[PDB]
Ligand SMILES: CC(C)CCC[C@H](C)CCC[C@@H](C)CCC[C@H](C)CCOC[C@H](COP(=O)(O)OC[C@@H](O)COP(=O)(O)O)OCC[C@@H](C)CCC[C@H](C)CCC[C@@H](C)CCCC(C)C
Ligand SMILES: CC(C)CCC[C@H](C)CCC[C@@H](C)CCC[C@H](C)CCOC[C@H](COP(=O)(O)OC[C@@H](O)COP(=O)(O)O)OCC[C@@H](C)CCC[C@H](C)CCC[C@@H](C)CCCC(C)C
Ligand SMILES: CC(C)CCC[C@H](C)CCC[C@@H](C)CCC[C@H](C)CCOC[C@H](COP(=O)(O)OC[C@@H](O)COP(=O)(O)O)OCC[C@@H](C)CCC[C@H](C)CCC[C@@H](C)CCCC(C)C
Ligand SMILES: CC(C)CCC[C@H](C)CCC[C@@H](C)CCC[C@H](C)CCOC[C@H](COP(=O)(O)OC[C@@H](O)COP(=O)(O)O)OCC[C@@H](C)CCC[C@H](C)CCC[C@@H](C)CCCC(C)C
C-alpha cells in the first residue's frame with residue numbers, strides 16, 4: 122500500500138532531474154559537452170518514465186515468489202538495465218576511450234543487471250541467490266575495472282575531470298554496493314524488511330545515483 | 343476479420359520494398375552509399391517480417407483493454423521500435439555526425455516508441471493517454487531536433503542531399519504526426535474508428551514512410 | 564528428464580571457457596587485442612549464464628506446441644541472439660571495418676535469430692517452417708556476406724589473421740548449417756529425434772562454435 126508515496130516522490134524528483142537537466146544541459150554543447158549532457162539526461166528521462174510505470178503499476182498483479190506485486194520490480198530492472206549501461210558509458214567515456222574496455226565493461230554491466238533480473242524472476246525457492254551471487258561477481262568486475270579506470274590516468278586534460286571522476290567513483294561504488302545489500306535483505310531476497318523499506322531504500326539509491334551523478338557531471342561540465 | 347487484406351497487402355508491399363532495395367541498393371557501395379543502403383534496407387526487412395507476424399498473428403488472443411486481439415499491436419510496436427531508430431539514424435547520419443546529437447535523438451526516439459508501447463499495453467481504463475501524452479512530448483522532441491537538423495547546415499556536399507533531406511523532413515513530419523492522431527482516435531486510444539481503419543491507416547503510413555523514405559534515399563543516392 | 568546431464572556439462576564447459584578466457588585473454592591488450600579478447604569473452608560469459616538458466620529452467624513449464632518444456636528453448640534463443648551478433652562482429656572486425664557492411668550483417672543476423680525465435684514460439688501447427696524458411700534465407704545471407712568477407716582481402720597485416728579467418732569461416736559455416744538442420748529435424752521442427760538429442764546436438768554445436776572460435780582467436784592473438 123505505502124509504496125505510492127515513495128514512488129510518487131521518485132516520479133516527481135526524477136522527472137524534475139530530467140527537465141532541469143534539459144534546461145541546464147542544452148546550452149553550449151556540440152561534441153563532448155553535448156555527449157555528456159545527452160548521455161546523462163537520457164538516464165533521468167528513462168528513470169522518470171519507469172517511475173511513473175512503477176507508481177501506476179500496469180500489466181498484471183501476479184506473484185513470482187511472495188505476496189508482493191511484480192510491476193514494481195520489473196520496472197526497477199528496466200530502469201537499471203538502461204541506466205547502468207549509459208552511466209557506465211558516460212564515466213568510461215570521460216577517461217578511457219578504448220573500444221575493448223568500454224564494450225567489455227558494458228557487456229559485464231549487461232549481464233549484471235540482466236542476470237539480477239533472472240534471479241529476481243526465478244520461481245524456485247532457493248537459487249535466486251545463485252543468480253544473486255553471479256550478479257555479485259559481475260558487479261565486482263565492473264568495480265575492479267573502475268579501479269583500473271581511475272588507475273590508468275593517461276590522456277587527461279584539466280584537473281576538474283580528475284576530481285569529478287574521483288567523487289563519481291566513490292558515489293558509484295557506494296550506491297552500487299548498497300544495491301545488492303538492499304536487494305538481498307529486502308525486496309526479492311529474504312524479506313528481512315517489510316515492504317515499504319525496499320521501495321524507500323532502492324529509490325534513495327536510485328535518485329541519489331542518477332540525479333547525484335548528473336549533478337557531479339553538471340559540476341564537471 | 344478484415345485486417346488480413348490490409349496486412350497481406352502490407353506483407354507483399356513491404357517484402358517487395360525489401361527485395362527491390364536489396365537489388366537496387368547493392369551496386370556500387372562500400373562506405374557512405376552502402377551505409378545508407380544497408381540502414382534503409384534493414385528497415386523494410388524488419389517491417390516485412392513483422393507484417394507476416396501480424397498477418398499470421400502468433401502468440402495468443404488475449405485482450406489488454408477491448409474486444410480486439412493483441413498480436414497485431416505488439417507487432418506494430420516491434421516494427422516501429424526498430425524502424426524508427428534506424429530511419430532517424432539514417433537521416434541524422436546524412437547531416438549531423440555529432441555523437442551527442444545522434445545518441446540523444448535515438449534515446450528520445452527509444453522512449454517515444456517504448457513508452458507508446460507502455461501506454462498501449464496498460465490495463466487500466468483511463469491513463470493510456472498519460473503515456474500517450476509522454477509519447478507526444480517525445481515525438482515533439484524528435485521533430486524539434488529535426489528542425490535543428492535542417493537549420494544547422496554546416497558540413498554539406500552536393501545540393502542533392504539538401505533537397506533529399508528537405509522532402510524527407512516533410513514526409514517524416516507528416517507521417518509521424520499522422521501516427522499519433524490515428525493511434526489516439528482508433529486502435530488503442532478511444533475507438534472512434536471501427537477496426538479495419540486502424541490497420542488500413544497505420545499500414546498506409548507504415549509503407550509510405552518506409553518505402554517512401556527508402557525511395558527518396560534511392561533518389562538521393 | 565535426461566537434458567540435465569547435457570546442460571550441466573554445457574554449464575561447466577562454457578563457464579570454464581569464460582573463466583579460462585578471462586585469464587588467458589587479459590594479458591597484454593589495450594586496443595585491437597583487448598577488443599578481440601573482450602568481444603570473444605563476453606560470448607562464453609553469456610552462454611554460461613544462459614546454460615545455468617537452461618539447466619535450472621526457471622519461469623514456468625508451459626508448452627508452445629508439443630509435450631516439451633519452454634525454458635530450454637527460450638534460453639537457447641537468448642544465447643544465440645547475443646552470441647551470434649558478437650561473434651559475427653568479431654570476425655567482421657578482423658577483416659572488414661565498413662560501417663555499412665557490419666551494420667547490415669548484424670541486422671541480418673538479428674532477424675536470423677529473432678525470426679528463428681518467432682518461428683520457435685508460433686502456436687499454429689504448420690507455419691513454423693515459414694519462419695524457419697525466412698531464417699534460412701537470413702542465415703544464407705550471413706554466409707554469402709562471409710563469402711565476400713573472405714573474398715575482399717584488402718587491408719591485411721600478418722599472414723596469421725588470414726589463416727585464422729580461413730579456419731574460422733569453415734567452422735562457422737559448418738556449425739551454423741548444423742544449427743538449422745538439427746532445429747528442423749528435432750527440437751521445435753518436426754520431432755524426428757526424441758528429446759535428448761536436441762540438447763546434445765545443439766550443445767555440441769554451441770560449445771564447439773563459441774569455445775572453438777574463442778580458441779581459434781586465442782591462436783590468432
Ligand atoms: C539491448 C539493450 C537492453 C541494452 C542497451 C545497451 C546499449 C547498447 C548501450 C549504449 C552504449 C552506446 C552509447 C555506445 C557508443 C558508441 C560510440 C559513440 C561509437 C564511437 O566509435 C569510436 C570508438 C571505437 O573505438 P576504437 O578502439 O577506435 O575501435 C572501433 C572499431 O569497432 C571500428 O572498426 P575497426 O576497428 O575494425 O576499424 O568507440 C567505440 C567504443 C564503444 C563505446 C562501442 C559500443 C558498441 C555497442 C553500442 C555496444 C552494444 C552492447 C551489446 C552487445 C550489449 C549486450 C548485452 C549482453 C548481456 C549480451
Ligand atoms: C544475458 C543477460 C542479458 C540475461 C539474459 C536474461 C533473459 C533476458 C531472460 C528474460 C526472460 C523473462 C522475460 C521471463 C519471464 C517469465 C514470466 C514470469 C512468465 C510470464 O507469465 C506472466 C507473468 C507471470 O508469470 P506466471 O504466468 O504467473 O508464471 C507461472 C505461474 O503460473 C506459476 O508460478 P509458480 O510455480 O512460481 O507458482 O507476468 C507477466 C510478467 C512479464 C511482463 C515479465 C517481463 C519482465 C520485464 C518487463 C522485461 C524487460 C524487457 C527489456 C527492458 C529487457 C531487455 C533485454 C535486452 C538485453 C535485449
Ligand atoms: C546497503 C548498505 C548498508 C551497504 C553500505 C555499503 C558501503 C557502500 C561500502 C563501504 C566501502 C568503502 C569502505 C569504500 C572505500 C573507498 C576509499 C575511501 C576511496 C579511496 O579514496 C580516498 C579518498 C580520500 O583520500 P585522499 O587521499 O584525499 O584521496 C585523493 C587521491 O586519489 C589523490 O587525488 P588525485 O589522484 O586525483 O590527484 O576519498 C575519501 C572517500 C569518502 C568519499 C568515503 C565515503 C563514506 C561512506 C562509504 C559513505 C556511506 C553512504 C551510503 C552507503 C549510505 C547508505 C544508505 C543506507 C540506508 C542503505
Ligand atoms: C535495444 C533495441 C530495442 C534498440 C535497438 C536500437 C539500436 C541500438 C540503434 C542503432 C544505431 C546504430 C546503428 C549506431 C551507429 C554507430 C556508429 C556506426 C559508430 C561510429 O562512431 C563514430 C561516431 C562517434 O562520434 P564522436 O563525436 O567522434 O564520439 C565517439 C566516442 O564515443 C568515441 O570515444 P571517445 O570520444 O571517448 O574517444 O559516431 C557515433 C555516433 C552514434 C551513431 C553512436 C550510437 C551508440 C549506440 C549504438 C546507441 C545505442 C542506443 C541505446 C542506449 C538505446 C536505449 C533505449 C532507451 C529508451 C533506454
Ligand SMILES: CC(C)CCC[C@H](C)CCC[C@@H](C)CCC[C@H](C)CCOC[C@H](COP(=O)(O)OC[C@@H](O)COP(=O)(O)O)OCC[C@@H](C)CCC[C@H](C)CCC[C@@H](C)CCCC(C)C
Nearest residue numbers: 167170180181199404406416420423452453456457460465
Ligand atoms: C524506456 C522505454 C524503452 C520503455 C520501457 C518499457 C518496458 C520495455 C516495458 C515492457 C514490459 C511488457 C513486456 C509487459 C507486458 C505484460 C503482458 C500484458 C502480460 C503477460 O501475460 C500474457 C499476455 C496477456 O496478459 P494477461 O495475462 O491477460 O494480463 C492480465 C490478465 O489476466 C487480466 O487483465 P485485466 O485486469 O486488464 O482484465 O499476453 C502475451 C503478451 C506478451 C507477449 C507482450 C509482449 C510485447 C512485445 C511482443 C514486446 C516486444 C519485445 C522487444 C522488441 C522490446 C525491446 C525492448 C528493448 C528496448 C531492450
Ligand SMILES: CC(C)CCC[C@H](C)CCC[C@@H](C)CCC[C@H](C)CCOC[C@H](COP(=O)(O)OC[C@@H](O)COP(=O)(O)O)OCC[C@@H](C)CCC[C@H](C)CCC[C@@H](C)CCCC(C)C
Nearest residue numbers: 504505508512513515516517519520521522523524543546
Ligand atoms: C492523422 C491526420 C489526419 C493528421 C494529419 C496531420 C498533418 C501531418 C500535419 C500538418 C503539419 C504541416 C502544416 C507542416 C508544415 C511544414 C512546412 C510547409 C515546411 C516548410 O517548408 C516549406 C516548403 C516549401 O517552401 P519553399 O520556400 O519553396 O522551401 C524551400 C526552402 O527551405 C529553401 O531550400 P534550401 O534551404 O534547401 O536551399 O515545403 C512545402 C511543404 C509541403 C511538402 C506540404 C505538405 C502537405 C500536407 C502536410 C500533406 C498531408 C498528407 C498526410 C497528413 C495524409 C494523411 C493520411 C490520412 C488518411 C491520415
Ligand SMILES: CC(C)CCC[C@H](C)CCC[C@@H](C)CCC[C@H](C)CCOC[C@H](COP(=O)(O)OC[C@@H](O)COP(=O)(O)O)OCC[C@@H](C)CCC[C@H](C)CCC[C@@H](C)CCCC(C)C
Nearest residue numbers: 220388424435438439648652661662665666670673674677
Ligand atoms: C537489442 C539486442 C538484443 C541486440 C544486441 C546487439 C548489439 C547491438 C550488437 C553489438 C555490436 C557493437 C559491439 C558495435 C560496435 C561499434 C564500434 C565500436 C564503433 C566504432 O565506430 C567506428 C566505425 C564507423 O564506421 P565508418 O564507416 O567510419 O562510419 C561511422 C559513422 O556512423 C560515424 O558518423 P558519420 O559517418 O556521419 O561521420 O565502426 C562502426 C561500425 C559498426 C560496428 C557500428 C554498429 C552500430 C550499432 C552498435 C548496431 C546496433 C544494431 C541494432 C539496430 C540491431 C537491430 C535488430 C534488428 C533485427 C531490428
Ligand SMILES: CC(C)CCC[C@H](C)CCC[C@@H](C)CCC[C@H](C)CCOC[C@H](COP(=O)(O)OC[C@@H](O)COP(=O)(O)O)OCC[C@@H](C)CCC[C@H](C)CCC[C@@H](C)CCCC(C)C
Nearest residue numbers: 388391401402420625627637641644673674677678681686
Ligand atoms: C525483427 C526480429 C528481431 C524479430 C522480432 C520478434 C519479436 C522480438 C517477438 C517476440 C515476442 C514474444 C516475446 C511473444 C511470446 C508470447 C508468449 C508465448 C505468451 C506469454 O504467455 C506465457 C508464456 C506461454 O504462453 P501461453 O500463455 O501458454 O500462450 C497461449 C495459451 O494459453 C494457449 O496456446 P495454444 O493455443 O497453442 O494451446 O510463457 C512464458 C514465456 C515468455 C517468458 C516468452 C519470452 C521469450 C524469451 C525469454 C524472450 C527473450 C528476450 C530478449 C533477449 C529479446 C531481445 C529483443 C531485442 C532485439 C530488443
Ligand SMILES: CC(C)CCC[C@H](C)CCC[C@@H](C)CCC[C@H](C)CCOC[C@H](COP(=O)(O)OC[C@@H](O)COP(=O)(O)O)OCC[C@@H](C)CCC[C@H](C)CCC[C@@H](C)CCCC(C)C
Nearest residue numbers: 725726729733734736737738740741742743744745764767
Ligand atoms: C546437421 C548436419 C547433419 C549438417 C551438416 C552440414 C555441413 C555443415 C555442410 C557441408 C558444407 C561443406 C561442403 C562446405 C565446403 C567448404 C569448402 C571446403 C571451403 C573451401 O576452402 C577449402 C579449404 C582447403 O582448400 P585449400 O585450397 O588448401 O584452401 C586454401 C586457400 O583459400 C588459399 O589460402 P589463402 O587464400 O588464405 O592464401 O578448406 C578445406 C575445408 C575443410 C575444413 C572441410 C570440413 C569438413 C566437414 C564440413 C566437417 C563436418 C563437421 C560437422 C558438420 C559435424 C556435424 C555434427 C552432427 C552430429 C550434427
Ligand SMILES: *C/C=C(C)/C=C/C=C(C)/C=C/C1=C(C)CCCC1(C)C
Nearest residue numbers: 201204237256257260300301304330
Ligand atoms: C539509476 C539506477 C541505478 C544506477 C541502478 C543500479 C543497480 C545496480 C548496480 C544493481 C545491482 C544488483 C546486483 C549486483 C545483484 C542483485 C540485483 C541488483 C540489480 C540489485
Ligand SMILES: *C/C=C(C)/C=C/C=C(C)/C=C/C1=C(C)CCCC1(C)C
Nearest residue numbers: 422425458477478481521522525551
Ligand atoms: C515504419 C514505421 C514507422 C516510421 C513508424 C512510426 C511510428 C511513430 C512515430 C509512432 C508514434 C506514436 C506516438 C507519438 C504516440 C502513440 C504511439 C505511437 C507509436 C503511435
Ligand SMILES: *C/C=C(C)/C=C/C=C(C)/C=C/C1=C(C)CCCC1(C)C
Nearest residue numbers: 643646679698699702742743746772
Ligand atoms: C553459441 C551459439 C551460436 C553460434 C548459435 C548459432 C545459431 C544459429 C546460427 C541458428 C540458426 C537458426 C536458423 C537458421 C533457423 C532455425 C533457428 C536457428 C536459430 C536454429
